[PDB]
Amino acid sequence: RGKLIAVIGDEDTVTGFLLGGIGELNKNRHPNFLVVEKDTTINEIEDTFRQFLNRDDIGIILINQYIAEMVRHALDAHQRSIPAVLEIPSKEHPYDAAKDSILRRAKGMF
Amino acid sequence: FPELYFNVDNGYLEGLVRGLKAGVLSQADYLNLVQCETLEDLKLHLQSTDYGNFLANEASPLTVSVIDDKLKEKMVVEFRHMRNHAYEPLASFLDFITYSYMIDNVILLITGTLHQRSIAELVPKCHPLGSFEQMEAVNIAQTPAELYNAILVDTPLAAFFQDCISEQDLDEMNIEIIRNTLYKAYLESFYKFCTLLGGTTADAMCPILEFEADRRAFIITINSFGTELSKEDRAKLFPHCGRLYPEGLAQLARADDYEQVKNVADYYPEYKLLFEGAGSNPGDKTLEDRFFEHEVKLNKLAFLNQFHFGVFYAFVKLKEQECRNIVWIAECIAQRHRAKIDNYIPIF
Amino acid sequence: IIETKMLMGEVMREAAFSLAEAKFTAGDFSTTVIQNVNKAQVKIRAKKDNVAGVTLPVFEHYHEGTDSYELTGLARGGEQLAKLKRNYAKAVELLVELA
Numbered sequence: 001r002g003k004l005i006a007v008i009g010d011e012d013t014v015t016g017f018l019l020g021g022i023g024e025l026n027k028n029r030h031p032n033f034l035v036v037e038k039d040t041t042i043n044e045i046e047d048t049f050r051q052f053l054n055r056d057d058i059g060i061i062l063i064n065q066y067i068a069e070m071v072r073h074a075l076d077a078h079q080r081s082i083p084a085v086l087e088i089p090s091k092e093h094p095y096d097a098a099k100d101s102i103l104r105r106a107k108g109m110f
Numbered sequence: 111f112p113e114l115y116f117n118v119d120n121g122y123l124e125g126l127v128r129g130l131k132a133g134v135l136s137q138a139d140y141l142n143l144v145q146c147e148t149l150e151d152l153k154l155h156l157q158s159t160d161y162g163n164f165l166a167n168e169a170s171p172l173t174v175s176v177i178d179d180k181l182k183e184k185m186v187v188e189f190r191h192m193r194n195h196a197y198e199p200l201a202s203f204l205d206f207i208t209y210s211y212m213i214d215n216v217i218l219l220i221t222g223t224l225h226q227r228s229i230a231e232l233v234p235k236c237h238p239l240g241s242f243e244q245m246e247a248v249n250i251a252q253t254p255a256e257l258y259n260a261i262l263v264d265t266p267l268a269a270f271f272q273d274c275i276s277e278q279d280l281d282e283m284n285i286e287i288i289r290n291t292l293y294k295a296y297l298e299s300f301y302k303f304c305t306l307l308g309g310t311t312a313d314a315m316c317p318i319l320e321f322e323a324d325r326r327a328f329i330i331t332i333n334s335f336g337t338e339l340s341k342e343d344r345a346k347l348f349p350h351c352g353r354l355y356p357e358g359l360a361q362l363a364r365a366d367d368y369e370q371v372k373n374v375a376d377y378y379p380e381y382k383l384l385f386e387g388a389g390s391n392p393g394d395k396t397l398e399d400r401f402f403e404h405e406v407k408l409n410k411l412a413f414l415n416q417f418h419f420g421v422f423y424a425f426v427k428l429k430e431q432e433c434r435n436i437v438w439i440a441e442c443i444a445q446r447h448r449a450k451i452d453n454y455i456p457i458f
Numbered sequence: 459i460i461e462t463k464m465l466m467g468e469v470m471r472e473a474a475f476s477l478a479e480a481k482f483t484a485g486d487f488s489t490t491v492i493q494n495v496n497k498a499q500v501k502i503r504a505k506k507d508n509v510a511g512v513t514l515p516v517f518e519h520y521h522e523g524t525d526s527y528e529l530t531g532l533a534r535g536g537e538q539l540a541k542l543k544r545n546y547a548k549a550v551e552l553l554v555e556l557a
């Protein structure tokens with residue numbers, strides 16, 4: 001058996017990865033992603049993130065860097081080594097290393 | 111001879127829509143928009159022309175999605191204001207312009223019901239020109255079969271569905287084949303309708319639709335070679351009102367490689383120049399961009415006749431191209447990638 | 459990780475720029491792409507590396523051939539959408555490595 005990637009991000013980031021071939025509906029008809037509008041509340045993103053990191057099918061979660069900062073509490077609380085979380089840049093948004101949850105954990109980095 | 115009636119009913123709107131076309135960015139205005147460093151500069155430039163105050167009463171953390179939606183809002187209010195005024199000889203013609211957006215809204219509606227998603231959730235995604243007159247299809251949403259029956263009653267689009275879409279076909283066909291087979295019926299019918307509006311309207315609208323029919327034929331063909339569409343499927347989607355209909359469409363149906371498409375385009379100087387004009391080389395303009403440049407040429411030429419409804423169509427497509435230009439510029443500005451920014455299409 | 463995040467910055471800038479190009483020639487394709495979802499063309503398989511005398515988990519980029527958006531852009535924009543699809547595929551390849 002394999003696993004699938006999942007996405008939490010704006011319409012453009014989600015659309016990009018869907019055309020990258022990332023998207024699948026689960027047998028319960030739920031997708032492997034959330035589109036985030038500017039009016040989306042913290043509970044929608046966070047409960048989705050808490051679902052995605054605990055589902056059996058999802059092996060990687062992509063989070064837009066701005067959303068990743070809005071959910072930073074639950075994100076930095078995610079300590080499991082296998083279900084990986086990638087903070088990713090976007091067209092009107094901060095760069096790839098801004099407050100990155102993995103880079104901050106290294107002692108060797110300045 | 112048509113001049114000598116046209117201004118009885120349309121004279122006001124003809125003056126209005128040319129006036130509205132004067133409110134477009136010139137080549138020098140695009141050459142000014144690209145000079146800047148942030149979307150606040152896009153606001154400050156656009157504040158000097160007809161779009162001024164379009165970002166008043168809006169949040170300071172501005173985004174390209176807000177510029178896109180506000181430019182569509184101006185385009186659609188500029189069009190609703192003409193459609194609400196026009197009398198029956200023109201009002202049917204403006205409704206044919208709206209069909210170029212209602213087809214895509216019908217594909218969203220069909221796609222929602224096939225996925226059992228409530229149609230009312232898709233109304234905010236649907237394009238604002240393609241507003242359905244009766245929302246009762248949307249309010250019911252009960253099944254795809256209910257949607258089909260409801261469209262065939264609630265919408266004046268029903269006459270196009272009856273020719274190409276059965277209820278069984280609606281479930282069995284891929285939605286992108288439904289999109290294109292609808293557009294075939296629309297474009298052939300809008301062409302026939304324009305040839306009933308004889309003289310200037312036919313003579314200077316029909317070249318744009320004849321081109322759109324040929325554009326569809328080329329663009330459908332080159333995009334099909336890696337795909338499930340057979341020779342019959344390409345032919346079934348090509349619009350029969352283009353110049354290529356007697357022969358070129360048949361050769362494009364037979365075609366299986368981009369060289370064979372170029373061979374068809376090489377019989378007609380108007381199309382030979384597009385395929386010579388873009389080789390898809392590194393740093394080149396694409397073939398699609400050459401068709402957008404040519405579409406703008408034809409639309410500009412439609413403003414050179416006086417008394418015809420062709421200006422209302424050419425206006426909508428040029429404001430759509432202007433929205434697309436402002437958004438592309440705003441993306442190249444916001445994404446810092448100014449190197450390709452010149453890929454906007456100049457208009458007037 | 460630092461090198462791969464720099465590469466990810468570049469491929470994501472290129473892919474995000476390619477969305478603007480696709481929005482040029484295809485209009486709002488995004489609503490169609492978001493609404494129509496079936497099966498993933500790209501999937502990951504987990505694998506074990508024994509390097510340094512310890513078990514380290516990794517992922518492999520696997521591809522199923524079938525394009526879930528094969529016919530998207532036939533009306534307009536399909537050439538630019540093919541370039542976009544390849545750029546996001548390269549982004550996903552780098553992200554599977556980053557994971």
